[PDB]
Amino acid sequence: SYDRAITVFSPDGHLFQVEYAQEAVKKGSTAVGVRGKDIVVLGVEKKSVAKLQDERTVRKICALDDNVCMAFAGLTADARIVINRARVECQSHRLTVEDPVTVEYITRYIASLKQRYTQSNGRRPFGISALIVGFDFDGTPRLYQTDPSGTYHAWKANAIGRGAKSVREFLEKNYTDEAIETDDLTIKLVIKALLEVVQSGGKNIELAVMRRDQPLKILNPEEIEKYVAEIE
Amino acid sequence: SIMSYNGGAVMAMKGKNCVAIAADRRFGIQAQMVTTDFQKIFPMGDRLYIGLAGLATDVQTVAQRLKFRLNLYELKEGRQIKPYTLMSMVANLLYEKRFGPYYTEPVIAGLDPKTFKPFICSLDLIGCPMVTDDFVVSGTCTEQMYGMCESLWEPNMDPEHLFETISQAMLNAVDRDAVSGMGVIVHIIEKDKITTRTLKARMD
Amino acid sequence: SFSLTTFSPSGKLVQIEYALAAVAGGAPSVGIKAANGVVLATEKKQKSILYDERSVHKVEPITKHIGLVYSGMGPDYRVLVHRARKLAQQYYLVYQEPIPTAQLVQRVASVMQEYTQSGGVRPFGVSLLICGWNEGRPYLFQSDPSGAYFAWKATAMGKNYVNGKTFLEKRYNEDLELEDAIHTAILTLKESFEGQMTEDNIEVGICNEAGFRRLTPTEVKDYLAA
Amino acid sequence: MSRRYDSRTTIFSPEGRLYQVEYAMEAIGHAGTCLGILANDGVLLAAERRNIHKLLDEVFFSEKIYKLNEDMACSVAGITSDANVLTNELRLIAQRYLLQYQEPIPCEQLVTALCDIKQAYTQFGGKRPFGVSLLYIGWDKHYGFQLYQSDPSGNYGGWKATCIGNNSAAAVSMLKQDYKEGEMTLKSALALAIKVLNKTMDVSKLSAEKVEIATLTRENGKTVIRVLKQKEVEQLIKKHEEEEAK
Amino acid sequence: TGYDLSASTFSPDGRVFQVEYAMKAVENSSTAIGIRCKDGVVFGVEKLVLSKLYEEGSNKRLFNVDRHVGMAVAGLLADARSLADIAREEASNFRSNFGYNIPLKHLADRVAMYVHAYTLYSAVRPFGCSFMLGSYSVNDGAQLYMIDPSGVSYGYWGCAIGKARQAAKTEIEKLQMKEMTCRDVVKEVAKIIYIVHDEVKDKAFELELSWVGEITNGRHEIVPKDVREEAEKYAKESLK
Amino acid sequence: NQYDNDVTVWSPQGRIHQIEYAMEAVKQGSATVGLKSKTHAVLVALKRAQSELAAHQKKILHVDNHIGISIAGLTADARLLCNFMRQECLDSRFVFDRPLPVSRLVSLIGSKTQIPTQRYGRRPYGVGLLIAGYDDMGPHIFQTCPSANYFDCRAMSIGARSQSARTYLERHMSEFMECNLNELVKHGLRALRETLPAEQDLTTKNVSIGIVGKDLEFTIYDDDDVSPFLEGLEE
Amino acid sequence: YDRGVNTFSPEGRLFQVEYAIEAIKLGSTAIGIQTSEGVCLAVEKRITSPLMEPSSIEKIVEIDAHIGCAMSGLIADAKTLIDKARVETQNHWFTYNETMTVESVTQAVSNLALQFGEEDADPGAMSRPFGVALLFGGVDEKGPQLFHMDPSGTFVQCDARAIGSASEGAQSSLQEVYHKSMTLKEAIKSSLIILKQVMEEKLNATNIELATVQPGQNFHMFTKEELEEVIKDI
Amino acid sequence: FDRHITIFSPEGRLYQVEYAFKAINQGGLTSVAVRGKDCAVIVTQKKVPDKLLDSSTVTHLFKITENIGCVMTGMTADSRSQVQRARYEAANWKYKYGYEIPVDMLCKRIADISQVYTQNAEMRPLGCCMILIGIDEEQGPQVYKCDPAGYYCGFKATAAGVKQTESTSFLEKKVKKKFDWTFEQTVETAITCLSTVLSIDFKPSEIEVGVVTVENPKFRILTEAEIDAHLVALAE
């Protein structure tokens, strides 16, 4: 087999391999997500295709379970492996425990994989950063972000991909108790969070929402334009 | 034994340029009967079929591994498999599992994929291929099915005779058996087409 | 335990690019598919008169209906003989039939694909010509070090293959008899090989309805009348 | 052992990309020009043959066009050796699917199954990645007629029309311009491939031998796939032969 | 040039430098000699005194492989102690299988298989010590073989290894060692080492002798203190 | 240059520089000294604290009732051999119901030390081990090396600034055999004086010892019982 | 890159491990405290944005009722070690039916840290050392015990040890203020004074986390009640 | 880079394998062998650097099986390794197929073992060429030579070592005359070859001569006393 260390230290202590991994995270498309009041909403920009691609495989907003969904920004390659093996854990947790999955329980097992891939022999750190968001028991939503390094955080409003820091500046300034008040204001905030990094993109914004007991629902392009129609 | 657990029977015959296959539809557990709608014969593609009897589990199991390895051979080579070649596949498949053997009595009948040339054969519980150009019978009523066949079998008969022949064969034979009966499916394999008929038998 | 084959900035495979460069630096080899049979002609060059000719042959049979030739590193061809022969027997176990030419060369080239991928193993420095007869259809295939097998009515390889292909652009016609195709391949190697032309230096074999049969130097001497 | 000669594909560039994957896309561009079209009546597939010689034979059904299963097929542009590895793995995944559910595998499921194997070597193992780009056609019970394109990095996506290999920038540009979305079907849109394959080929007088065309259409509840007759494709080119005059 | 960076890489002149360096590592070791005669095989080892703090008998270079097989080593000491256990476990597996003591020709050959196995790959390194394997049996008699970093067996009537080698080998050639008896061999072995070593870098040393042959009843045995000092006094005649 | 990369590469002078630098790391740390008489053996370990707020590191690792060891070198590298040495001593009394001989244990430890050396990819152990033990033949002082070499010594001082310590040990070596347990500790602690500069010399706080004897099992003393051991001695 | 992991330096040091201890200088400043009446550990959360929740991030977690934790540098490296540390801790009570001593906690962690290696091992082994500086406190029948651990893997009983970026001047400052019998409440005082001085941000209940362990009171995580009191009682 | 390990050179060569060919040549020993009508003879240089060395302890003629002899030329480190590995094969042949291994398959299996050294980059080629002899009931005397690259072929007259170039020339001069093949007179040709090249007139202990015959399929080593008889008495 192939056995050697990949990521090694540096004279300044920083990790060459891991920093280049987070660099590829920023090179990907811009994805955003927020934790609403009674709901959760995800969104990601779409590079504009010209009259070709099908939106079934292109959709970057997936669902790990009925309780928890996710989005990703980075290399599309490593994203599909995490989505598959996380859904396995969701069914394995229900197989082991009759109680449903917990957003914090599933999130840690995800980022824990990327930590294993970093320190394992011959493996590689992923170039993806995923937003794990879902509903806990009693209906309390939770939004967590992963890291190629294996850490995970908690975020009320979050933005990933290209210009993630630029949108985060719009977040911290315009995020207040006025934000994510209602299902409408939560979605309009996600749209406005994608309006800074958009250059003549227009309709390219696609949205998704999960409402209480119901599972992730994809807003139709016309339903998206309904909330996009109000800008000024 | 376990071969008589689910019962059932499969019969196949050969005409001049054509071959015939018929089997009972009964599915049950020992003395208890369950349903008469079971299918013991599966299509192998053009001009080829395979019958199965014995334990009903291995009938639905081993037959599923067929099209698995069959398609892989049909995808690599641009031709369909020969019935003489398919016989070696089932005999090799049973002898990978030989140690804790599947329960079934395969029946293979068809034509030369090359043209019109007919070929028939049957296998054994342990996977021994056996080539008989006359007829093959398998099941719990086997000993009862022989005398009917061998008496009414002839080397060369048109599809018209094969209709009544294997029919009258199955009818009186399957009668004396307790665990076989209640509907019969008949498959007739011609050169340019295939005839499939249903027989009216005593419900017992 | 690591594969040394990497992608060049132009996209080419550097290790396999030099693999064929070793094949072109070997002895010339040609083949022709015409009429009911396929001929393969190779040139065996010793380093002196002190080495036995009949001891080691370049033309080797695989099965009854299939045979192979080569130009390149000698020892690398001996590995393929064991793996091709053993593969054909594993075929005869399952399907109880002789192996077709298309099925053989496929998985034989897969061995080339494995060692251009699995780590710690260099690619092959050989290129083989595939000769087979199945169901009345003559089969002449050409394999490379990378593992890509094509179909050819006629082909030339080894040394001076450019002039060998030029001869096949003219001397090779259709509806050509197998016997005339043998003498045609001799005219192709007439310019390439120099010095003393004998029946022991040239090694020719054919495959037809009767199966793959290697030719003896006595029979070749009659075929050298041109 | 000799870490001096270890290329370490898993290492990221200072630009945040992969060395081998970036050079893999260029190697695909050197290959032959291949295109595909998703229409209403079915899928359309056409491929140029860059190998041109008087001694060529091609005893097989087609060169760059292969049949995955009953309901699906594929094309290829890239390294010709690693294509047979991916073709076999697609036939293994599709048949292992038939074991459990006893049903034909949908188009999207078979594509994403191999792409996990493609990028598994870029994730670890130290073995070189695959330089093969594959086009996917077929029909499934739900989504119906589908056309898919794959990349050597493991990424993929759906496409209504696309092109792979040489002349990718010119062909795809010429494709979109006249492409009729959900409108122009097999009969009509088959004339576009011949029109595009003549423009993509720098040598004039497009020959029916230098190209290959195969279609897949499900009719009367049965999937039908065939390789178009070269004698008819010539007459299909005879259409394009009279197109510039009239 | 970088051609010496690994043992798996051959020199453009067709040499293996890593194995040659292992022979040069033996040249750093102290001088050790051995001689075989009719009665048996006699061993000797120069034991360098690095400091007075060492206990008498410390840094023992005489290894007991088996009942009839002794060994003396020159090179890296731990590499010899590691191989000594390999040879002991090998001779033990022999008697556990075939039910008798392994002959010297068989043991030295299988040990050389382990020595050369480490010269083949790039994942390991050759042994940095060259050693001698003596044996005595009523079926054979006095037998002496030598293994090198390349793992090759060399039989010798008399031989020398360590730093000073060629000088001690010539002195052995000046006198026939086969006619003499083990009682008189320890006299010359002691006299040679006094001639081999002079005081320049190292300060003091001691004589370590070993006996195998008929006098030891076919068993590897160290020299007794009484006879050793007696042979040294006869060797001090050349010093005075 | 290019010969320092790994253990397998030999220098043109026939020397492995990785093993050479393995012996250098031993000189980079606390200096310990030990000695044996005809009856009792003592291991004097010098405990060093990084700062005054942090306490002193533990240089003594208890092995068995008849066996003890002091460590000088890279700290945590001795933990692997510790748990191994303890497991080997337990397996001896678990099977033979007998304490493993001191000379036989070190021969087995020197084997596990040498195995990773020649095999590429395995780091050689960069910690030196001074081990003592008592048996029917009396006490024993065995000093080891990262090269896996081990000797038998009356007294030995290893570590940084051990030069003047060894010189003290050589001249007084004749007394080390005939002195009793009390005088062994005295001259053993005064030997530790030469391992440190003229400013900070010795205290009962930073110096711990251990002893093994005829009827006395190996014990470890740190502060309490060490105070009367040090005091009453001229330096 | 032109060097190995286990390659020795001419000065007798490891290239790999030396940069480990060199890497921990970028971590978060944290200090442990050992008092006669109990053990006290504090850590700076170092929150990079108000949207990031300081309550979810925990650099002090409960292994056993006696033993706490500390984290610095890369957070996930500590989480990997604490996971197996909590498994072997319950494996102790699963056998001996008693709480694991503070010493046996670090012995299990020191074994897991020393196993670092690449070749001649399984893929499930950790290849590179952790960039975390560990502080394991606790109180048992033996009394309060606080241990320090670095990427080397050693554990030593110490009254107070500073970790993180400010560990240079903090460890010398912890020496000066802490002496003799100084207890819990008096320790929190000098703790929050030195920490607030070295870190950039001002002291707040949500900017740092604090927890203590006592002989009679097991590990108790300070909520908004206890945190807001000790910051204004400084 | 290509000059160190085994990878394809830009010209198609293999330098790791070619530097091995110079390693066999580096041994400083020249070996010759000639296949006669009824016999096959091997004559190699037997060197004794010091008188303290012993004769029977160092020998270049090894026995793979009873009916097959073996001679080795190169650095002796690689010499003993192949012979033990060859005996693990020739003996295994009888455990499976139940008869003495032919010289054809013995050279094929040993080559395959050497072919892995070239194909697998983890290992290295071996620095000794192997010349295997023997006899079969069909082709009679068999003489093959296996290089570390893995190539082997039937050689009527073969040579190796530093003088291989000059040795091959004199072997051609004898065969060019259609030299009549008899047992002992062929033994002269192999000995006179090395005798005329170096211009020495070797002593009986300076050469090592193996023999195999139709009458004696078991490999034998020519006695040094019989060597002296056919050196001095017959130089003619």
Residue numbers in the entry:
A (entry chain O): 2 to 233
B (entry chain S): 2 to 205
C (entry chain M): 7 to 232
D (entry chain N): 1 to 246
E (entry chain R): 6 to 245
F (entry chain Q): 4 to 238
G (entry chain P): 8 to 241
H (entry chain L): 9 to 244
From the paper:
We then in vitro assembled the purified human PA28αβ and bovine iCP into the intact PA28αβ-iCP immunoproteasome complex in the presence of glutaraldehyde as a cross-linker. Regarding the interaction interface between PA28αβ and iCP, our PA28αβ-iCP map revealed relatively strong pieces of density corresponding to four PA28αβ C-terminal tail insertions into the α-ring pockets of iCP, including the C termini of PA28 β3, α3, β2, and α2 inserted into, respectively, the pockets of α1/2, α2/3, α3/4, and α4/5 of iCP, and a rather weak piece of density for the C terminus of PA28β1 in the α5/6 pocket. However, we found no obvious extra density in the pockets of α6/7 and α7/1. Interestingly, PA28αβ overall displayed stronger interactions with the α3–α4 side of iCP but no binding with the opposite α6–α7 side, consistent with our observations of the slight leaning of PA28αβ towards the α3–α4 side and more intimate interactions with iCP on this side. In our PA28αβ-iCP structure, all seven activation loops of PA28αβ were resolved, with the ones interacting with α1, α3, α4, and α6 of iCP showing stronger pieces of density. In addition, we also observed conformational changes in iCP induced by PA28αβ binding, including a slight shift (up to 2.3 Å) in the reverse turn regions of the gate keepers α2/3/4 and the neighboring α5 in iCP. In contrast, in our PA28αβ-iCP map, the N termini of the α2, α3, and α4 subunits in the PA28αβ-contacting iCP α-ring appeared disordered, suggesting that the binding of the PA28αβ activator to iCP caused these regions to become more dynamic. This plasticity in these N-terminal regions may have disrupted the allosteric networks in the gate region, leading to a partially open gate in the contacting α-ring, while leaving the gate in the opposite α-ring closed.
Proteasome activity is fine-tuned as a result of the association of the proteolytic CP with diverse proteasomal activators (PAs), including PA700, PA28, and PA200, that can induce the opening of the CP gate into the central proteolytic cavity, allowing substrates to be degraded. In contrast, PA28 (also called 11S or REG in most organisms, and PA26 in Trypanosoma brucei, TbPA26) stimulates the degradation of peptides in an ATP/ubiquitin-independent manner. However, lymphoid cells and cells exposed to cytokines such as IFN-γ alternatively express three homologous subunits (β1i/LMP2, β2i/MECL-1, and β5i/LMP7), replacing the constitutive ones, in the 20S immunoproteasome (iCP) particles—with this alternative expression resulting in a change in the proteolytic activities. We determine the uncharacterized cryo-EM structures of free bovine iCP and the single- and double-capped PA28αβ-iCP and PA28αβ-iCP-PA28αβ to resolutions of 3.3, 4.1, and 4.2 Å, respectively.
